[PDB]
Amino acid sequence: QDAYVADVDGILDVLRAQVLERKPDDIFQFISKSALSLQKDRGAESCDRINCKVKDEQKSRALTIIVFGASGDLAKKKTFPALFDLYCGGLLPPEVNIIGYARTKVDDVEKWKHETLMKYFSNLSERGCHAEDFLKHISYFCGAYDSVDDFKRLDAVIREKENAFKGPEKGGNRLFYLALPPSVFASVCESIHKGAMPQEVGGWVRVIIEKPFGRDTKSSAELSQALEPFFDESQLYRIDHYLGKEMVQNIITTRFANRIFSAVWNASNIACVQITFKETIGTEGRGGYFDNIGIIRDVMQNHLTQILALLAMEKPRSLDAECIRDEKVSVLKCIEPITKENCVLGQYTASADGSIPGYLEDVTVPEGSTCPTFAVMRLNINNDRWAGVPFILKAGKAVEQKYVAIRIQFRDEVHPYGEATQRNELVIRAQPSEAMYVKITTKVPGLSGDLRQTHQTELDLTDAYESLINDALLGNSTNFVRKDELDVAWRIFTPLLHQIDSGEIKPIPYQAGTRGPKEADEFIANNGFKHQK
Amino acid sequence: ADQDAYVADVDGILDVLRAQVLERFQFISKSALSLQKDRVKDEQKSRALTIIVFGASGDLAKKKTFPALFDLYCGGLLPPEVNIIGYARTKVDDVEKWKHETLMKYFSNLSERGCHAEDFLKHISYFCGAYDSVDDFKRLDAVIREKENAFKGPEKGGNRLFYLALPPSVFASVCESIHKGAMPQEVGGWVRVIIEKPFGRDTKSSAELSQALEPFFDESQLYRIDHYLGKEMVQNIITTRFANRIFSAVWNASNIACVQITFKETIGTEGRGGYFDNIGIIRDVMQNHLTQILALLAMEKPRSLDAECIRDEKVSVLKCIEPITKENCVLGQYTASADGSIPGYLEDVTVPEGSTCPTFAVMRLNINNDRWAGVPFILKAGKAVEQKYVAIRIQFRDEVHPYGEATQRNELVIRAQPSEAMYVKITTKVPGLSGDLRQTHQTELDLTYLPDAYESLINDALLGNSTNFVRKDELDVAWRIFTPLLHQIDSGEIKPIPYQAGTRGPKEADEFIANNGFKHQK
Ligand SMILES: O=P(O)(O)OC[C@H]1O[C@@H](O)[C@H](O)[C@@H](O)[C@@H]1O
């Protein structure tokens, strides 16, 4: 009896959240349709069948997935659970070999997999009863990241499994995951180049790189130069959290598969472009790690710029991965480096109710830090398509809501309807929930009147990490940052980053839970952005 | 009044019960138990208002005109002292009974509106006269002037709205009779005349009739009604097209590849083939309604939101059309359905033997102006087809690069009946696996969110806007598009293709549509 009340109460709060994000102006009809979407979301789940949707090419050669730092935090929370989810869906070959590689000694190996790895398997994956069947593919290798001799032994271990493959293709494909700090990558790749390359008889090698790719142009070019003598770009897969989201991948399709959007994607129709990233959480007591990164290096240099490239890129000659990336780097060469006056920075303080402590109230943050936890800036693309178009990138910690979306405003509708209408908007939201809607003006369906009584109406339309790993198995480099793409990305931000490190610009304080500095919203308004709400 | 208050309710209840019972009693018992559980601007009140419905004894007035007037009062859109006068040819010595047994019978939703029905009929009076007697219109004017002077308001006089629910052969006499006997008082008041039935059958026939009414009423007083010009989605065409930059920038020949305006009905002529045989499907709906839609689609941006500014642009684009010719038209005539439920058109006894009247017609129009040059506009209408469907389908040119056969052409659909809908068909990638991104699917982008069209038309007439009313110049330019073709049809140069009822029509129709820039992918 006591258990009944919790479920009905837990459901309505989810129902309340949905009717507040979609904002349907016919209140009654939406809740009925939205409610039926989540009824099948929790129920109707069984553990009877595992349909492997793998291509005939994937089962031809043995596959080996090596996760370096398997005892680490990133491997246990995200890397291994995603491999489990991929396996649950039947996306791994039946004879996949997974090897955990770490420095740490582990006795009672099976206890560790069940007590450490299985512990972080998610409740949403808990409807999997074949977890024991999945762990059968996992083995543990204790070695150092600097020993070519250990890699020769690892190679003997992988070769044992590779030669035991019951398929036509010989050799074996090897996907290496570096769930490690960036200071180790050059050492592991040198060691992998000398000790654990794929067999000469057949098999490719691919390396996934996770942690930040430097902190400036020089740091990244030094790091990219360390790996060039070992791996080309068809082998290096620089991963990104957002590129795997379906709505971000769909931007290429919504823009270029449709003439309606194609014809207005220029300066002659587009008036203001905004790419916003909002989080409710602060630094959560680990502000010391963030003090050396800043909000710009964290999410604006890599993720938001990755988004901005997909919006402004020219038409690729084809849908091939590197053809798409070429246009991605080419538009990133049409940008001007961000300047000091085109940037407004912020740093969050304690909340009004005191629930969220300030950034400087953290003991791990150095005293007198000018590290930004908020930044809004305008970029300029100098080409025939985007000349004069404002591109606003915004990122902020401990703000009024967690919200990640694109909001494009089209050119002001030149007076056939006057003030009765406003600017058209195209919205692409990826977080908290996927949604893509267009805001246009229609007449109010009550009476004809003067036809000046109109209303703004929206035209709605409804895991990332694991899909990206699969693209790596599938060899889809479309959603991975390229070397030239990374260096030209860095050249946009480094002059400003150097000015930030020398103290030329300092963040404006703002209480947690607000939108941020008052000057930021003014700066956005001063750069072609207007709203009527 | 301890007896009249009981009797008035008892009379109001039973008169509602009679209207509803159409089938072969026990229903009156069920309805009583259902009814047992059932528990304006200052300018509008400045002058008296008088609504005259000519031809009240006709089918159109009793079924459609007066029931719609009831809805205007239910919505609270009529002034509290409005005076409605029913004018008809036949004398009926059933003064109060006729209002309850004939007019109320066709009122809708009598299970909630039967308590304001008695207050509505109190505004209705009946005048029996001839449509040709200046003396009678003098007597009618003397009845109206008494109520006008009995108005408790600052402004004197009164406004008079005349409705001609009559065949067109009676219009010239009634407008002449109004001009000599029942014009508004010299102290104040406007006059407006609503005209419904077809305005001739060609350019000349329409021209003779338009010349007949000019010596009696100008264009600010003549409100030529059109059923669809008041439709919510058709009225919305002007807003969605110009209030939004997204649509404005693609509304030309550079982005648009084919436009289709389709009107589909499942019923045949329903044993009334004799009346339709002399009209044809082109004059019935294609010359007036579909072209009224077509005018709103191809009009340029009006200089303002003023009514005549919009109608000027409505006329200006209809003058850029070339008259439809014989090779750009496929006609059809329906035969008995495959299920036998719908008898053939020639199976009607009221239809002449060997008749070539079209029950189906698709034709292409060419608009020669900068915005639409080369854009095919297909107008299609058909009786006794696979479904009742009335919509606009604009197909844009798909840029193949860089998606090729993985994408198709974007579509804009605006449906007004049977159900309101405005959606865009685009291709997005399938939200499954990333794969090659060539795995896409065509997804439609639907629009999310008193009512009836006829009622709104009357109000716009009461408000005096005239945006949604056919203009004199607009009518002449509309006919000159269709008249050369109708003459070739009336001379037998083109003959309809037989097709069984329930199908899409003749197979040659779909070929003609396919041969003019329109593609399907299913
Ligand atoms: O005018 P019709 O074709 O007889 O049908 C009723 C129509 O009347 C209109 O005025 C209504 O808005 C529509 O709901 C409907 O399409």
> B445 contacts in A (CB within 8 Å)?
438, 459, 461
Amino acid making up residue B149: N
Q: Does the distance separating the beta carbons of B434 and A249 come in below 8 Å?
A: yes
The answer to whether residues B360 and B373 touch, using CB atoms and an 8 Å cutoff, is: no
- What angle (nearest 5°) sits at the alpha carbon of residue A120, between those of residues A175 and A211? 45
Q: What is the DSSP letter of A441?
A: E
Q: Does the distance separating the beta carbons of B446 and A253 come in below 8 Å?
A: no
Q: Which of B363, B365, B358 is nearest to B490 (CA)?
A: B358
The answer to whether residues B234 and A443 touch, using CB atoms and an 8 Å cutoff, is: no
The answer, for A219 touching chain B at a CB cutoff of 8 Å, is no
Nearest atom in ligand 1 to the alpha carbon of residue B230 is 10
Q: Which residue among A26, A416, A420 places its CB closest to the CB of B302? A: A416
Q: What is the resolution of this structure in A?
A: 3.3
CA nearest A263 in B: which residue? B250
CA B452 to ligand 1 centroid distance, Å: 6
Nearest atom in ligand 1 to the alpha carbon of residue B416 is 16
Q: Which of A172, A243, A232, A171 is nearest to A207 (CA)?
A: A232
Q: Which residue among A319, A418, A420 places its CB closest to the CB of B437? A: A319
Pocket test for ligand 1, best of B231, B290, B455 (most atoms within 8 A of CB): B231
Q: Does the distance separating the beta carbons of A448 and B235 come in below 8 Å?
A: yes
Q: Which of B48, B78, B52 is nearest to B149 (CA)?
A: B48
Q: Is B522 annotated as a binding residue?
A: no
> A249 contacts in B (CB within 8 Å)?
429, 434, 437
CA B414 to ligand 1 centroid distance, Å: 15
Peptide bond into B358 cis (omega under 30): no
Q: Whose CA is nearest to atom 9 of ligand 1?
A: B453
Backbone angles phi, psi at A174, to 5 degrees: -130, 120
Q: Does the distance separating the beta carbons of B440 and A470 come in below 8 Å?
A: no
Calpha distance A21→A371 (Å, rounded): 32
Q: A529: which 2 tokens?
A: 């952005």
CA nearest A266 in B: which residue? B249
Q: Which residue among A443, A458, A467 places its CB closest to the CB of B448? A: A458
Window 341-380 of B, Cβ < 8 Å to A: none
The answer, for A7 touching chain B at a CB cutoff of 8 Å, is no
Instruction: List active site positions of A.
Output: 303
Residues contacting residue A121 through CB under 8 Å, at least 6 positions apart = A81, A84, A128, A131
The answer to whether residues A443 and A409 touch, using CB atoms and an 8 Å cutoff, is: no
Residues contacting residue B464 through CB under 8 Å, at least 6 positions apart = B190, B192
Q: Which of A284, A274, A280, A276 is nearest to A312 (CA)?
A: A274
Distance of CA B71 to the CA centre of its chain: 17
3-class secondary-structure state, position A437? strand
Q: Which residue has the tokens 């003749």?
A: B506
Q: Please report which helix (H) or strand (E) contains residue B444, including its range.
A: strand B440-446
Give the up-direction half-sphere exposure of residue A347: CA atoms within 13 A in the CB hemisphere.
20
CA B387 to ligand 1 centroid distance, Å: 17
User: Dihedral of the CA atoms B253, B256, B261, B262 (nearest 10)?
Assistant: 150
CA A137 to ligand 1 centroid distance, Å: 66
Amino acid making up residue A294: G
Q: Which residue among B247, B249, B433 places its CB closest to the CB of A467? A: B433
3-class secondary-structure state, position B432? coil
Window 15-54 of A, Cβ < 8 Å to B: 24-26, 29-30, 53
Q: Whose CA is nearest to atom 2 of ligand 1?
A: B227
CA nearest B306 in A: which residue? A450
**What are the residues facing A404 on neighbouring strands?**
A277, A431
Residues contacting residue B457 through CB under 8 Å, at least 6 positions apart = B225, B227, B229, B230, B468, B469
Q: Give me the CATH number covering residue B78.
A: 3.40.50.720
Residues contacting residue B453 through CB under 8 Å, at least 6 positions apart = B227, B228, B230, B231, B232
Query: Most A CBs within 10 Å: which of B231, B241, B246, B411, as the mutation test of the A interface?
Result: B246
Distance of CA A51 to the CA centre of its chain: 28
The answer to whether residues B165 and B60 touch, using CB atoms and an 8 Å cutoff, is: yes
Count CB-CB contacts under 10 A for residue A493: 23
CA B453 to ligand 1 centroid distance, Å: 6
Q: Does the distance separating the beta carbons of B242 and A264 come in below 8 Å?
A: no
The answer, for A471 touching chain B at a CB cutoff of 8 Å, is yes
Instruction: List active site positions of B.
Output: 289
Calpha distance B253→B514 (Å, rounded): 18
Amino acid making up residue B125: S
Ligand 1 is surrounded, with C-beta below 6 A, by B 227, 230-232, 416-417, 452-454
Calpha distance A328→A485 (Å, rounded): 7
Q: Does the distance separating the beta carbons of A441 and B244 come in below 8 Å?
A: yes
Q: 3-state DSSP: chain A helix, strand, coil percent, rounded to 5? A: 40, 20, 45
Q: Which of A281, A443, A288, A264 is nearest to A363 (CA)?
A: A288
CA A513 to ligand 1 centroid distance, Å: 51
What crossing angle do the helices spanning A2-21 and A27-42 adopt, rounded to 10°? 130
Window 483-522 of B, Cβ < 8 Å to A: none
Calpha distance A313→A311 (Å, rounded): 6
Pocket test for ligand 1, best of B263, B417, B459 (most atoms within 8 A of CB): B417
Give A21-30 contacts, CB < 8 A, sequence gap 24+.
A21/A432, A21/A433, A21/A435, A22/A435, A22/A460, A23/A458, A24/B448, A24/B449, A25/A455, A25/A457, A25/B448, A25/B449, A26/B448, A26/B449, A29/B449, A30/B448
Q: Does the distance separating the beta carbons of B397 and A451 come in below 8 Å?
A: no
Pocket test for ligand 1, best of B64, B264, B383, B454 (most atoms within 8 A of CB): B454
Q: Please report which helix (H) or strand (E) contains residue A515, including its range.
A: none
- Domain range for A91 is 63-238
The answer, for A421 touching chain B at a CB cutoff of 8 Å, is yes
Calpha distance B480→B207 (Å, rounded): 11
Count CB-CB contacts under 10 A for residue A141: 19
CA B480 to ligand 1 centroid distance, Å: 27
The answer to whether residues A491 and A251 touch, using CB atoms and an 8 Å cutoff, is: no
Q: Is B291 annotated as a binding residue?
A: no
User: Dihedral of the CA atoms B244, B248, B250, B251 (nearest 10)?
Assistant: 130
The answer, for B448 touching chain A at a CB cutoff of 8 Å, is yes
Q: Whose CA is nearest to atom 1 of ligand 1?
A: B227
Count CB-CB contacts under 10 A for residue B427: 20
Tally of helices (H runs) and strands (E runs) in chain A:
18, 15
Nearest atom in ligand 1 to the alpha carbon of residue B455 is 10
Calpha distance B45→A136 (Å, rounded): 86
Q: Which of A439, A374, A436 is nearest to A405 (CA)?
A: A436
Amino acid making up residue B19: A
The answer to whether residues B106 and B62 touch, using CB atoms and an 8 Å cutoff, is: yes
Q: Which of A129, A125, A76 is nearest to A100 (CA)?
A: A76
User: Dihedral of the CA atoms B257, B258, B259, B263 (nearest 10)?
Assistant: -160
Q: Is A16 annotated as a binding residue?
A: no
Q: Is the dihedral of CA B407, B410, B416, B417 positive or negative?
A: negative
Window 238-277 of A, Cβ < 8 Å to B: 244, 246, 249-250, 252-254, 256-264, 268-269
Give B429-434 contacts, CB < 8 A, sequence gap 24+.
B429/A246, B429/A249, B429/A250, B429/A252, B429/A253, B431/A246, B431/A250, B433/A53, B433/A467, B433/A470, B434/A244, B434/A249, B434/A467, B434/A470, B434/A471, B434/A474, B434/A476, B434/A478, B434/A479
